[PDB]
Design a protein around this ligand. Structure first.
Ligand SMILES: [Ca+2]
Ligand SMILES: [Ca+2]
Ligand SMILES: [Ca+2]
Ligand SMILES: [Cl-]
Ligand SMILES: [Cl-]
Ligand SMILES: [Cl-]
Ligand SMILES: [Cl-]
Ligand SMILES: [Cl-]
Ligand SMILES: [Cl-]
Ligand SMILES: [Cl-]
Ligand SMILES: [Cl-]
Ligand SMILES: [Cl-]
Ligand SMILES: [Cl-]
Ligand SMILES: [Cl-]
Ligand SMILES: [Cl-]
Ligand SMILES: [Cl-]
Ligand SMILES: [Cl-]
Ligand code: NA
Ligand code: NA
Ligand code: NA
Ligand code: NA
Ligand code: NA
Lengths: 597, 597, 597, 99, 50
């Protein structure tokens, strides 16, 4: 008899399809995640004491001493148990914030400011989201990020140096990186980073492969404060998709006739056609030169959960992203998929073709089929947004269940406390001795900057402070540094977009923001940009924006981007079982190879 | 021994969780979908001929005769086979468009306009997306929409009357429905609809339950052209969420201190804070009074696949939705989830609380836990968008595999052809005799309107035409009328938003668009609106926008809303197996009851 | 990844719970049941004959000869096949009752009385209920009762002696066991039983363990006619729960105030508060001194199925159980769970605490939770009643499918026939020679008693008769002797009650029935009774009541009590899988150990 | 050969009978229960307040104000969570009665 | 005093009551409840006796 398949009911075929995708995900196997060894390494220096200090772990929210070290190690150990359990009662039983007044229940802050504002505590954001399952994509716990840099490492000294340079450079305009007025600061930054072993010496055979891949070499004005995704280092700093608007309604080709929108110029003035309404690319303007958490008492209050969220001031109006601070403001409040949805809307409005390995992409006189629900605009619009939460569950697992890495502000706190103590011949937080020893010039500029801030904030003669100035009044979100929610979603979202569009398409005209006015100008770049390159650059812009704000390190961002890419790839693979058509997505990966799914 | 559960590996628990969700969906069972009987009822009037005419089926794209009937019944029968197979080759083998010129290869159109533009054909949009499976939610084919109204029915006569009144009312401003200058037309509309049995007589015992649920009673200015979801018929016609902006960055409460955004007024001028950038509620302005497909030859060309997409003209600028035509323009190009994403961004910017039955919604001093990835803003932002494509697969099944209902333009074409023939004592399309008999007054106004359009379009002495004027040059999308992509997505997305937010929260200040200027004014409405009511009203606005454009009937939209609600509910139910927390979504459904999931 | 459990649908969790309980019951394994070997041992004495006689088997209903032996061995063999099949046709095909008159179909009885009453036959009661499955608890056939005593054994001689002593003692008042007027009879009973090997010699090493456990030693006035459950032999003969009433509605503590029912005295006058109505403990009064089946022809008619049910006479009114006969009347008609439901209502009305290892039993200011549905009154009220039918299926299996032991009346029949024949130098039923030889004094008293009865019943000069006088006109129910429906339900029901209540609670005031009036008097008992002890005593009272009626032997009752306890324990164990709470039942068993379930 | 059934042990037949009853109950399928919409409809009339009032819900035992409305909406929300969890500790943590 | 209307929930239609009379006042709607005396025989009568 002739070999055959058999039909079954639609309902069984649907069930079996979903089981087959679960089976595909199971059959990928799982990998463990390794932490960097710091959490039980560093010990309380107190002679009669057998506790870890937890100084290199995220402990924002647990009560800290005057040096920024947690007072009671049980508070961190309890937090770790609650992270692994997820039980709401156990979470509500944790200690959060500083000692409260017995009679009134008020938290007593260190700073006059926090007490005068009557601040309450804020709590951890989804400390057990890494336990949540998902109906699609790699399970949160199936994949890994590699160990984070340790405080004593050349990589960390380079990372924190870079963050102080970004902080002190917040008022520099992207379009003026190479301008004479900025030469002194830009060259100082370049030379300082080039003076560090991470950047000036290559990895050596036998180093961890993750280090080899993410290690950077010579700093130049062309790569200063940029990411390393392919495409990020070519052409202007900002992705086209974060400054240009799009083709507008009314511009169209109808057979042999070209119509021109009466609003066509809006494309070049930062308006994205968003259906029949618009999105403006112009960002709100945080007050220039105002940074936060430059005073130790206010800093410690923030470390003790004081809720400063919403305290920033702004200038009137909005402009195309102009300064480093403006990129920090952009990433303070974005929906995590916002940048990529906006890019997707630009690509759609501009008529950029879909990946030509999808079905039905020919002229309809040939294929009799146009695309929308599947393989067209509605499809990509859902898929680019849906991956974000799947990527976030995986990065929460790394953040809280695995690595619990301290945020940059906390590292700056260690550096400041150490240096102040060393000036009195005392050793506090010797773990950051190398950073203190090597970043003297950068720290002196931060001291001066901090003094000015602390005077402006109303302290006429402040104690010296070497804290990392924060762009945001509350500093980092209430969750660990490694990885990053922004960067994991960036990695997942631009993966979907590069796969779904023809992302080899070249950009026709390249723009930058004008040096003198709030407008676009034609770039002088001579070279070719592609859609994939500008999507990678967008991911790097959002991710590095967090670093420019003071809330992530380079390694957090790069490793998160890779994690997000894995999540998106797994979702595409599982979803491939649901379609009858013969097609695939061509995806150029961050590593320069292409996977066909 | 004490009864117990056992642990297993995380990977097996993830696999078993996905299988258990698939099992929950399979255990719901499936229901058949019934079509209204027309497809094989209406017969080619040719005496020597044993074929159906397919005149009440969607046949846009297949070659039609001078009366708008398909020329070869095999063309439709092959299209039905291609819809149920999905095979790309079989789709590419279909006949699409009319005979082509040997020398140029171009389609030979009927109209001078189409020929002068050298239009090509456009093809069906995802005619087999109803075959696609999904990793989550009810399978596309597991659920049903009820049979559509038949051409001979009181319901259809009422539906098509309403669509002509909307078309002829396209220049009326929402703000001025009750103004003296509009009283003659508004009263004509109300009186005409009240003269129809559907609206002036109740359903009778024994009628189909779906008819009983969707049947409308007495028309008034307060309900004219509105939907029937709860909340839609109270307060102003447009949902707050399609005209108001939101709170802006810089407005906040930090303990006992209030900060005010320097651009706080933008909230009342239609700007949604979209991260740190903005969305403008102002819609592009299609040329007032210009309608399309009012000439029979142009109409037939469109029925024969002529690609008029992109042909509209616009005035400069943008304004808050002002006229009926502006709501048609809004729905011409929206991403399908756009309205609901925008509402969600408003609710988030305004600080509207989440559903209090979610976990962690208390002050953090009580629960030690804030929300983002799960149970907070990132969660809803992905969930509201991801349901769209699942809802679209189900509605594509109903559109193409089940009901294949002709779009309103095609019904208007039958009416026009019938009436013109009857004036010459011939009977063509007796199926629409009742609509012709009953809508004389409306059709006379359409004739006058169509003559003016046809003169403007360059025909100095046009033949009489009773066609339904289209807001869009191409008329309907290239897919069947029943149900609607917009409406099914609206149903799924507002279901998610009502469940995820505390949607009992009351609206503080109610706005409308000013009668005289492009700005918001405080409404005189004196009752109470809720977030759930205004989300339902938003769904109805987008759904009826399609009707006002000429491309759906009332029944298409209402039954699609219900289908979308079922898709979203199923997704929530299946996803409930992935969380460890003790919580549920409270969902007020379209029927007035609440489900807790 | 962290090891985890996964959720599944409620419906699957319910299914899996029920399967897990079936699996628990399966995994207990099963045990065989062994009969005592008599059924094929005793042979028809007729020289040319190769049939068993079946004289030690229950054959009530099959036609018997003049000596009480079945006429046709096929009738018993057919009955056994019908028992094991359960098929209704096969049961209806059996031979039941004596030969019928060919012309009228009437059964022709031996006795003038049965013929004058025109009695018809009664049939076997659920002869195949031991085939029935159950949704909960040990399957009927999974557990066993040990072989019954054989007719030739010292245990049986002791058993039947005791039953004749009870019969001849039916008018003795419990409260007067130790009274001078009864000394002669009471001492005769004590001395006669002490003259038998069963009671006066201990078991020997190597005897069956079941014999060792149920063997009794020295008879005393304190243990005469009592059971051997722990608690039965301490204090007054009758359980408090069969004579005392309860606290009444209106007696309550409300905060610091005590209210006293206007009906409080009813507690001491035998009224149980039964919700807002009452149960009276006072029993109907069967005519003193009237016994049944003392005439051989009437006896044989009863053995031949004559339906004498309902023939007893009563005196007016009702009284607290006073005499041995009154306990026999109590157990003639009780619902099988009645005694224990009544005890449960007493305990509830009196506020006896539930088992403190159940949840929510603390003051509600501590636990915020009171009990009713689960772990409270409604729970125990259903559970104590539901176990009865499960216990009855198991005892039916033993009764009919396994042991088929003759009822005491039939043994008395063998004894009478044997002794009458021996007086004429003939040997009939030599199997009961030992009982005849050893119980001469008891049999002479029965002869005299029987003569008086037979004279009163209208025979002026009766033949001598040594039959066991029956309390009930119909003698035993229509099913075998081993085990007992009453006793198996007693064992199951008091198991539930001891587990569910705090059954270590001590009784405050102990009562007995007054020697002179129908009322309670304070007992002279100096000692402590507990709830568990009085529940065991109640079980023994109901079980021995059947023996006092003439319808069971000691071994029937004790072994049935153990079987019932097993059934209840198995139900509790299986049900333990259905609850989420952390709790268990502490159960003091009949053997003096405690199981925690 | 003549089609037939086969016997099995009594213990397996009892097990299979209990499974078949569980299977009959599972094969009935399940239906959702819908509430009347009031719980999140009625709102605390306090203008500066974004809470439901729960006035049409059973709140006997939670502390009420002088009008019979619960004082703290978290008390009812916690009672709802305790109802759906069943956990004894969570139940014991609820607020029951007044100061 | 008004009947349910077409379109009302089926559960309302089933349980809705009409005109109140002395014969139905404070009674239920199960079949049998509205015929004969208000109290069931089973809550007032005793039984045949032993
Ligand atoms: Ca195509
Ligand atoms: Ca919270
Ligand atoms: Ca309690
Ligand atoms: Cl099916
Ligand atoms: Cl696989
Ligand atoms: Cl995040
Ligand atoms: Cl890969
Ligand atoms: Cl695993
Ligand atoms: Cl299920
Ligand atoms: Cl669609
Ligand atoms: Cl539902
Ligand atoms: Cl279920
Ligand atoms: Cl087991
Ligand atoms: Cl029985
Ligand atoms: Cl046991
Ligand atoms: Cl077995
Ligand atoms: Cl079944
Ligand atoms: Na767009
Ligand atoms: Na590409
Ligand atoms: Na709600
Ligand atoms: Na009681
Ligand atoms: Na006890």
């Amino acid at each position: 008899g002739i070999p055959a398949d058999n039909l079954q009911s639609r309902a069984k075929a649907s069930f079996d399809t979903r089981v087959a995708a679960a089976e595909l995900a199971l059959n990928r196997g799982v990998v463990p995640s390794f932490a960097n060894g710091e959490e039980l390494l560093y010990r309380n220096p107190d002679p009669d004491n057998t506790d870890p200090s937890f100084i290199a772990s995220f402990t924002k929210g647990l009560p800290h001493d005057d040096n920024g070290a947690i007072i009671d190690p049980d508070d961190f150990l309890a937090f770790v148990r609650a992270i692994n359990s997820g039980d709401e009662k156990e979470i509500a039983d944790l200690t959060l914030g500083p000692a409260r007044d017995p009679e009134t229940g008020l938290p007593i802050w260190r700073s006059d400011l926090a007490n005068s504002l009557e601040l309450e505590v804020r709590g951890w954001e989804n400390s057990s989201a890494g336990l949540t399952f998902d109906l699609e994509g790699p399970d949160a716990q199936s994949i890994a990020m590699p160990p984070a840099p340790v405080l004593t490492s050349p990589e960390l000294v380079a990372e924190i140096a870079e963050l102080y340079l970004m902080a002190l450079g917040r008022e520099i305009e992207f379009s003026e990186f190479d301008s004479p007025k900025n030469a002194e600061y830009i060259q100082f930054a370049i030379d300082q980073l080039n003076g560090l072993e991470w950047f000036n010496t290559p990895a050596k055979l036998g180093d961890p492969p993750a280090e080899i891949r993410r290690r950077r070499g010579e700093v130049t004005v062309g790569n200063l404060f940029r990411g390393i995704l392919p495409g990020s280092e070519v052409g202007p700093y900002l992705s086209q998709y974060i400054i240009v608007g799009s083709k507008q309604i009314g511009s169209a080709t109808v057979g042999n006739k070209t119509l021109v929108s009466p609003n066509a110029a809006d494309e070049f003035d930062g308006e994205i056609a968003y259906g029949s309404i618009t999105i403006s690319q112009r960002v709100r303007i945080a007050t220039p030169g105002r940074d936060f958490m430059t005073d130790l008492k206010v800093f410690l209050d923030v470390q003790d959960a004081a809720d400063f969220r919403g305290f920033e001031s702004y200038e009137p109006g909005a402009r195309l992203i102009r300064t480093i601070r403006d990129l920090a403001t952009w990433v303070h409040f974005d929906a995590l998929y916002e940048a990529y949805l906006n890019a997707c809307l630009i690509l759609l409005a501009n008529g950029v073709p879909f990946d030509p390995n999808l079905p039905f992409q020919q002229e309809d006189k040939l294929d009799n089929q146009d695309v929308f629900v599947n393989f067209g605009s509605a499809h990509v619009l859902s898929l680019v947004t849906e991956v974000a939460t799947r990527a976030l569950k995986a990065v929460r697992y790394q953040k809280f269940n695995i690595h619990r890495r301290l945020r940059p502000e906390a590292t700056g706190g260690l550096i400041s406390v150490n240096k102040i103590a060393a000036q009195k011949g005392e050793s506090i937080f010797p773990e950051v001795d190398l950073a203190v020893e090597e970043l003297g010039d950068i720290l002196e500029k931060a001291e001066i900057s901090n003094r000015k801030q602390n005077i402006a904030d109303g302290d006429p003669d402040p104690d010296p402070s070497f804290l990392l100035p924060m762009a945001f009044a509350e500093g980092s979100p209430f969750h660990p540094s490694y990885g990053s929610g922004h960067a994991v979603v960036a990695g997942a979202c631009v993966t979907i977009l590069k796969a779904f569009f023809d992302s080899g398409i070249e950009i026709d005209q390249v723009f930058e923001v004008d040096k003198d006015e709030d407008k676009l100008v034609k770039s002088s770049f001579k070279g070719t940009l592609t859609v994939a390159g500008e999507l990678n650059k967008l991911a790097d812009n959002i991710a590095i924006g967090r670093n420019m704000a003071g809330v992530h390190y380079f390694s957090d961002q790069f490793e998160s981007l890779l994690l997000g890419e894995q999540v998106a790839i797994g979702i595409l693979e599982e979803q491939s079982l649901t379609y009858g058509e013969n097609f695939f997505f061509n995806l150029p990966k961050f590593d320069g190879t292409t996977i066909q799914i």
